[PDB]
Amino acid sequence: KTVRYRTYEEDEPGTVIGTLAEDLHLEGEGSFRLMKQFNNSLIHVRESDGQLSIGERIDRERICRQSPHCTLALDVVSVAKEQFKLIHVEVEVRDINDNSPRFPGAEIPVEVSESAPVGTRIPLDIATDEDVGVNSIQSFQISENSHFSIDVQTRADGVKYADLVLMKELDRESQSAYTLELLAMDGGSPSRSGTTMVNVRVLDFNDNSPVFERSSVMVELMEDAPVGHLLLDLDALDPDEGANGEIVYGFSPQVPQEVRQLFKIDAKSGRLTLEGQVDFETKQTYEFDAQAQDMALNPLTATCKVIVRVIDVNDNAPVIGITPLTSISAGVAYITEAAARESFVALISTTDRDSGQNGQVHCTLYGHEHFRLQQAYEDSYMIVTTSALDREKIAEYNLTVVAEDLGSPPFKTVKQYTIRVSDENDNAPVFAKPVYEVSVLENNAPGAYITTVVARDPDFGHNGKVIYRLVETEVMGAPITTYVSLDPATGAVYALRTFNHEILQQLDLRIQASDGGSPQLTSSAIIKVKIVDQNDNAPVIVQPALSNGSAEVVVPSRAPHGFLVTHIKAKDADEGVNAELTYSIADEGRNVFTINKATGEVFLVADVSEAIGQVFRATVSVSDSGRPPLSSTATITFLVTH
Amino acid sequence: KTVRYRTYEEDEPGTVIGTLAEDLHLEGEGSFRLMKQFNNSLIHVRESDGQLSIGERIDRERICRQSPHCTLALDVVSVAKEQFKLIHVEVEVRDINDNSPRFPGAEIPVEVSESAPVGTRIPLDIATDEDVGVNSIQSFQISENSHFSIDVQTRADGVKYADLVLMKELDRESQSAYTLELLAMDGGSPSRSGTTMVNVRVLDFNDNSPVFERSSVMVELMEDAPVGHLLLDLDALDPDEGANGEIVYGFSPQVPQEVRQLFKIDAKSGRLTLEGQVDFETKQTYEFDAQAQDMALNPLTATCKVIVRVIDVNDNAPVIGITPLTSISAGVAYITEAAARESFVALISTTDRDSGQNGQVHCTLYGHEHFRLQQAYEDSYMIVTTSALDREKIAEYNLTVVAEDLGSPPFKTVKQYTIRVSDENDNAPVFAKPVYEVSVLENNAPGAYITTVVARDPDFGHNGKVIYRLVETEVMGAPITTYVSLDPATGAVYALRTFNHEILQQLDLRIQASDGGSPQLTSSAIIKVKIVDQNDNAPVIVQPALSNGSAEVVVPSRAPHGFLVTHIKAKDADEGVNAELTYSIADEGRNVFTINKATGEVFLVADVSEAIGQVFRATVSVSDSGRPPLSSTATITFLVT
Numbered sequence A: 001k002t003v004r005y006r007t008y009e010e011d012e013p014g015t016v017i018g019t020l021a022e023d024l025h026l027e028g029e030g031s032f033r034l035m036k037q038f039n040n041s042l043i044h045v046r047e048s049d050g051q052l053s054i055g056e057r058i059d060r061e062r063i064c065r066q067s068p069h070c071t072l073a074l075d076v077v078s079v080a081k082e083q084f085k086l087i088h089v090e091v092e093v094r095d096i097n098d099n100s101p102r103f104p105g106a107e108i109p110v111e112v113s114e115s116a117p118v119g120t121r122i123p124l125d126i127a128t129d130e131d132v133g134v135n136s137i138q139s140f141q142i143s144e145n146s147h148f149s150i151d152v153q154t155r156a157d158g159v160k161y162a163d164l165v166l167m168k169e170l171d172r173e174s175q176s177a178y179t180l181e182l183l184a185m186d187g188g189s190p191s192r193s194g195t196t197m198v199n200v201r202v203l204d205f206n207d208n209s210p211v212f213e214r215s216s217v218m219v220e221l222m223e224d225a226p227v228g229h230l231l232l233d234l235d236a237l238d239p240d241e242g243a244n245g246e247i248v249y250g251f252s253p254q255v256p257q258e259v260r261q262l263f264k265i266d267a268k269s270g271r272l273t274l275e276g277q278v279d280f281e282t283k284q285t286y287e288f289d290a291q292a293q294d295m296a297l298n299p300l301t302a303t304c305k306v307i308v309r310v311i312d313v314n315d316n317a318p319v320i321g322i323t324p325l326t327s328i329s330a331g332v333a334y335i336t337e338a339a340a341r342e343s344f345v346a347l348i349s350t351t352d353r354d355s356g357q358n359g360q361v362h363c364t365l366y367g368h369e370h371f372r373l374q375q376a377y378e379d380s381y382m383i384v385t386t387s388a389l390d391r392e393k394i395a396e397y398n399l400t401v402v403a404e405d406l407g408s409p410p411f412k413t414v415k416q417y418t419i420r421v422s423d424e425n426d427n428a429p430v431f432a433k434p435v436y437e438v439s440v441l442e443n444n445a446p447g448a449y450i451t452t453v454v455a456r457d458p459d460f461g462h463n464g465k466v467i468y469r470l471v472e473t474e475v476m477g478a479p480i481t482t483y484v485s486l487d488p489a490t491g492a493v494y495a496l497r498t499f500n501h502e503i504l505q506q507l508d509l510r511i512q513a514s515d516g517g518s519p520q521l522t523s524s525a526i527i528k529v530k531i532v533d534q535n536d537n538a539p540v541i542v543q544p545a546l547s548n549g550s551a552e553v554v555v556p557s558r559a560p561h562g563f564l565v566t567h568i569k570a571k572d573a574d575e576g577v578n579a580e581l582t583y584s585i586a587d588e589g590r591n592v593f594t595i596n597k598a599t600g601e602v603f604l605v606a607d608v609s610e611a612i613g614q615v616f617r618a619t620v621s622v623s624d625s626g627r628p629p630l631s632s633t634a635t636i637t638f639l640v641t642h
Numbered sequence B: 001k002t003v004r005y006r007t008y009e010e011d012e013p014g015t016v017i018g019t020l021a022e023d024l025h026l027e028g029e030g031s032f033r034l035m036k037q038f039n040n041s042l043i044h045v046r047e048s049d050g051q052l053s054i055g056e057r058i059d060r061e062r063i064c065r066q067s068p069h070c071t072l073a074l075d076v077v078s079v080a081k082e083q084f085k086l087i088h089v090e091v092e093v094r095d096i097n098d099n100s101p102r103f104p105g106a107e108i109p110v111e112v113s114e115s116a117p118v119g120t121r122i123p124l125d126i127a128t129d130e131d132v133g134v135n136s137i138q139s140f141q142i143s144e145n146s147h148f149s150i151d152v153q154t155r156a157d158g159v160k161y162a163d164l165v166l167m168k169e170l171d172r173e174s175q176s177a178y179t180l181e182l183l184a185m186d187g188g189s190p191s192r193s194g195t196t197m198v199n200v201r202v203l204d205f206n207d208n209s210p211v212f213e214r215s216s217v218m219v220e221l222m223e224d225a226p227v228g229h230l231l232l233d234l235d236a237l238d239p240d241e242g243a244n245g246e247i248v249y250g251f252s253p254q255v256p257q258e259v260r261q262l263f264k265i266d267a268k269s270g271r272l273t274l275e276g277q278v279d280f281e282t283k284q285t286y287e288f289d290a291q292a293q294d295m296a297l298n299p300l301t302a303t304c305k306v307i308v309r310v311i312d313v314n315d316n317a318p319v320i321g322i323t324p325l326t327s328i329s330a331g332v333a334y335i336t337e338a339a340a341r342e343s344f345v346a347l348i349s350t351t352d353r354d355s356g357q358n359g360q361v362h363c364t365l366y367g368h369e370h371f372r373l374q375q376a377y378e379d380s381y382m383i384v385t386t387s388a389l390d391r392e393k394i395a396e397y398n399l400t401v402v403a404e405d406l407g408s409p410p411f412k413t414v415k416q417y418t419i420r421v422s423d424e425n426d427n428a429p430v431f432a433k434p435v436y437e438v439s440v441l442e443n444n445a446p447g448a449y450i451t452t453v454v455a456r457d458p459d460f461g462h463n464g465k466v467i468y469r470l471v472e473t474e475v476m477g478a479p480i481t482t483y484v485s486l487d488p489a490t491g492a493v494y495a496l497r498t499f500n501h502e503i504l505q506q507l508d509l510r511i512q513a514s515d516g517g518s519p520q521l522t523s524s525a526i527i528k529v530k531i532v533d534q535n536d537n538a539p540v541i542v543q544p545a546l547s548n549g550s551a552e553v554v555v556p557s558r559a560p561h562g563f564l565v566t567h568i569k570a571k572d573a574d575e576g577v578n579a580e581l582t583y584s585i586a587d588e589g590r591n592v593f594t595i596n597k598a599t600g601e602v603f604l605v606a607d608v609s610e611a612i613g614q615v616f617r618a619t620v621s622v623s624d625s626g627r628p629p630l631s632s633t634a635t636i637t638f639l640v641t
């Protein structure tokens, strides 16, 4: 039969569970023993009457571990009136709360990503309480915090594990670790707690792109900055951890290739440097996005707008260009001597590629005062005449143009230029004097030389070649061209005929000088050729009438001394000295007749000597004054009559 | 001086810009000419009046490209009254919209991660309009969508570039591509359009862990399921692309080594198989988290709660254990023959480790009807006595216990057991006969043997060895211990004295037989020794009185034959035959007297011849029957007066 008692674990040995003999009204005898003791039993039985007392130590957690019931079963045998009996006894061992919740370790380290969704579960080491029932772990508490809570769950074989659950989204940059106190406690007003620490390690996600310390940057860069010049040390920052926050600098992928060759970005430090050479006169502003990138699985990027303003340097000098209105030779401007005052000759351009004062030009002209500088428009100055030009006075000019910029120091450019004045037919031939006077002795040879005329045209080339022409004029009906000829190149006048003074005294040539111009220019002069007389006409006796060189006149013997017989008149063709007639009645032996040398009047020296019938011959000559003189003779006879 | 006109690009050649002679009130002359004719000039001037017309085509976009202003400069020279003059002229060339916005290429390919925050800018190929001012690129057109909204920004050098900007979070699993044709038109009333293709390709991020078609699953596993048995084909899914969505199955990191050695998960297919062996009697429920993992750089994981409930099979047979109250040998129970009805002898345990009917046991006992089975508690049956036991009748019993479980089919276990009955001193010695009788011849030697007695004790060991003792009783005053002795071991009786029948006829010995037990048991018997006579008593003659064998008697002579003279009496000490008196009348010569052998009376044969004075001599003897017979002698004389 089954008799049942109840004990309480870890009681002092020798406590009264019960007594069989008395509990079951057992009158008779008893030799109460346990039937077998393979291990040293925990309960002792009084042989006298079957009293069951706590023998050794009774630890429920050692004999039943986590089993909800713990019954110690023993078989006692007795003897009553020579009958051996058996009684089966079951002693329920009640549980005492002599064990407290325990955790494996004082700290539980756990890891979770900041990118995990709310509700993600994180395992925790289970607590254990070696008691059973209410004396086992009933409740769990977590320390007050914002993010984490616990939930307890039981497995199908009854093992009661715990989970840490995430309530709010994490951010490792705000908070990267958590320290939470975890505790478990059992039932019954005598309550026992056990504790541990949860160390939550928040693992980083790359949820932050880099960002530059400054969103945009401008830097100034001299256009003569040397290679390696440091423009700027770019800086960025990333809050993420380790590689996710480690930055590498460079260009935005859209930056053209010119910039990538001109400028360089150190990928580690962000230094931005010049590797090429810039030129303000070509491009004065660069605009590009630099970028920063973190070294993460899914990299994040940020950009910074960089502006480089290039600054101008005086690296250009003035350029002088000269373009003439009219010219043939290089670097020579031509202009007609006919150009009026303030005529444009050539245009000067003075330019400077730079900007500001460095590109501003002052132009100055050096040369004869006949030319002036006149500004036409920006950096464009005209050369203009200030006075009338005269090729015959000045045929060319050498000029000098200087152009300086306003840099400090300034660049100076110098250039030379030549002006040549074009000929117009501005001057006509000019005879030394308008009227020339020359003389020619009568009875010349034919083809004799009289004179030469000269006219002058100072114009050059064909416009200044003189041509001489005999103007056609009449001379005693006939034309001038028959008496005289003129070499049209030299202007030499040659006589074609032999001239006779007795006929023609003066010959008036009219010569024209012409240039080889278009229109032709002419001028006239006159040569007054003088023919002067000579002694080629001997005088002739007119009265008395001549008969083969002889004559006769009679004389009355009735007449006085110094008689008026006859009057010898004579004529000469020449002029002046050569027409000075002097008379002589001479060589007669006896002095018979006497002559008046003035008016050729012949008188008698002797008295009336004979009566009648006398013949007397003498000679009477007429001469002129010129050298050599010529003369003619008349032989006249006189007779005495009554 | 600078005189200013204005024209419009690509106008009809020969069109009138203006007239210098008339515009500048130029009275006088003019032989208007250009100074520069080294390249083929695009403007020609009429000599008469200085009016210049468009010679060739004038294309602003080719002489000034993208330059805001386009002024052609020309230097003309005239001659007025022999004076050469110069006039500088600036002809503004105005732009018309004979050029349309355009994009460098027919397609713009673009890639963006679905994980990019709002506001991320994607650069786009810049548009170009070769006109200037309002005729330049003024407007950018965007396609209506929820995620991409673009923004136009202007640079230091005035070009209007456009950025593709994202305002709302993308999801490549929701939407993975976009195709947007990008075009722009310029300002001013006649607008010209130009276009390209934008192909937005969304790149995948590993933003979705795998998840199982079922969060938990339970499977039943027979405890005799063979190695390789298929428990379950795990299935999991991942929306992500390529390797980010390709799964490998295995155990959660917390799974003990017992489970990892016992069960196996194929990483590729997720098949869960038994490689070891389970035993319901050892562990009947397994619980573990299987997990699936995507093959991504930093993979994402999911778990599935797997329950394996083990099923019981009848793989254990009942075990029989027997524990006796009292025992010496292995597998042998002892019990005293003194036990009463229904005394506990031994406890049988019949158990089966299985569960259900497979573990439920029926116990049956086979053997002598003196023992039966009585259940004490669960799987615990008592062997009990049913009747009184007697070691002397049955000392040992061979029993058999049978224990079957209730499986289908059932397991049966048999066991043998032996019970031995312990001896108690329940029996006392008992003699063959209660009263023994033997005889002894008189006059025996001293120290002679009479008989031997034997008693019987069936009890065992000391409880059955008999010792005999002579009970102290008196015989004619003295104690019996003096006539006889008893050997306590053999039971032999030796005669101590020599016995005389005349005195002692019957000797009543009282023997006790006792066993060697505690308490000691005794029983008594009696030996009646009878003493029988012998002939060691010679008889003597009493009447008449004797004198060394002689006597004398007188008688008167007056009588005939047969007279009463004298009467010869004798006595014998023995009994029976040896006390048989025989009378003899011995020789006297003459036939004088004759004797009656019955009553010892002697008479006379001859008459009275003599009166007085005669002496007569004879002998008369008495004898007994025994062998040898004994006799004494007496001589009697008779005389007359």
Ligand SMILES: *[C@@H]1O[C@H](CO[C@@H]2O[C@@H](C)[C@@H](O)[C@@H](O)[C@@H]2O)[C@@H](O[C@@H]2O[C@H](CO)[C@@H](O[C@@H]3O[C@H](CO)[C@@H](O)[C@H](O)[C@@H]3O)[C@H](O)[C@H]2NC(C)=O)[C@H](O)[C@H]1NC(C)=O
Residues within 6 Å of the ligand: A396, A397, A398
């Ligand atoms: C204007 O300038 C011309 C150009 O000549 C010069 O060339 C350079 C070397 C520099 O000196 C410049 O400053 C200058 O422009 C002058 O022409 C030169 O004239 C001289 C003298 O008349 C010539 O030399 C002569 O040669 C002949 C024959 O060999 C000799 O008989 C003379 O005795 C004399 O040495 C020279 O050839 C000529 N140069 C050229 C290139 O033609 C010119 O004098 C000047 N005009 C004025 C008005 O100043």
Ligand SMILES: *[C@@H]1O[C@H](CO[C@@H]2O[C@@H](C)[C@@H](O)[C@@H](O)[C@@H]2O)[C@@H](O[C@@H]2O[C@H](CO)[C@@H](O[C@@H]3O[C@H](CO)[C@@H](O)[C@H](O)[C@@H]3O)[C@H](O)[C@H]2NC(C)=O)[C@H](O)[C@H]1NC(C)=O
Residues within 6 Å of the ligand: B397, B398
């Ligand atoms: C109770 O059991 C004992 C011993 O246990 C027995 O051992 C074997 C026989 C097993 O097969 C078991 O089945 C069995 O329980 C029995 O004792 C045996 O008795 C036999 C009786 O014939 C003996 O054999 C005889 O022995 C004599 C003298 O030695 C010979 O002259 C005969 O020719 C014959 O062989 C045997 O020796 C004996 N053995 C032992 C170990 O004791 C016993 O019989 C049994 N009791 C009952 C009532 O069945």
Ligand SMILES: *[C@H]1O[C@H](CO)[C@@H](O)[C@H](O)[C@@H]1O
Residues within 6 Å of the ligand: A185, A191, A192, A193, A194
């Ligand atoms: C166990 O102990 C804790 C303190 O460690 C208590 O707060 C709890 O209520 C239980 O008694």
Ligand SMILES: *[C@H]1O[C@H](CO)[C@@H](O)[C@H](O)[C@@H]1O
Residues within 6 Å of the ligand: A183, A193, A194, A195, A196
């Ligand atoms: C659990 O354990 C902690 C530290 O071990 C204690 O501070 C707490 O009161 C509880 O007993």
Ligand SMILES: *[C@H]1O[C@H](CO)[C@@H](O)[C@H](O)[C@@H]1O
Residues within 6 Å of the ligand: B184, B185, B191, B192, B193, B194
């Ligand atoms: C080209 O087309 C666009 C619209 O498609 C207009 O903005 C433009 O004016 C031109 O017609």
Ligand SMILES: *[C@H]1O[C@H](CO)[C@@H](O)[C@H](O)[C@@H]1O
Residues within 6 Å of the ligand: B183, B193, B194, B195, B196
């Ligand atoms: C610009 O060009 C596209 C083709 O690339 C046209 O489809 C569009 O209408 C616009 O004219």
Ligand SMILES: [Ca+2]
Residues within 6 Å of the ligand: A009, A010, A059, A060, A061, A096, A098
């Ligand atoms: Ca305890």
Ligand SMILES: [Ca+2]
Residues within 6 Å of the ligand: A060, A061, A095, A096, A097, A098, A099, A130, A131, A132, A135
């Ligand atoms: Ca406890």
Ligand SMILES: [Ca+2]
Residues within 6 Å of the ligand: A097, A098, A099, A100, A101, A129, A130, A131, A135, A136, A137, A186, A192
């Ligand atoms: Ca507890």
Ligand SMILES: [Ca+2]
Residues within 6 Å of the ligand: A114, A170, A171, A172, A173, A207, A208
């Ligand atoms: Ca963060």
Ligand SMILES: [Ca+2]
Residues within 6 Å of the ligand: A114, A172, A173, A204, A205, A206, A207, A208, A239, A240, A241
């Ligand atoms: Ca982060």
Ligand SMILES: [Ca+2]
Residues within 6 Å of the ligand: A206, A207, A208, A209, A210, A238, A239, A240, A244, A245, A294, A296, A300
């Ligand atoms: Ca980052």
Ligand SMILES: [Ca+2]
Residues within 6 Å of the ligand: A223, A278, A279, A280, A281, A315
């Ligand atoms: Ca430069």
Ligand SMILES: [Ca+2]
Residues within 6 Å of the ligand: A223, A280, A281, A312, A313, A314, A315, A316, A353, A354, A355
């Ligand atoms: Ca410069």
Ligand SMILES: [Ca+2]
Residues within 6 Å of the ligand: A314, A315, A316, A317, A318, A352, A353, A354, A358, A359, A360, A405, A407, A411
């Ligand atoms: Ca300069």
Ligand SMILES: [Ca+2]
Residues within 6 Å of the ligand: A337, A389, A390, A391, A392, A426, A427
């Ligand atoms: Ca002149």
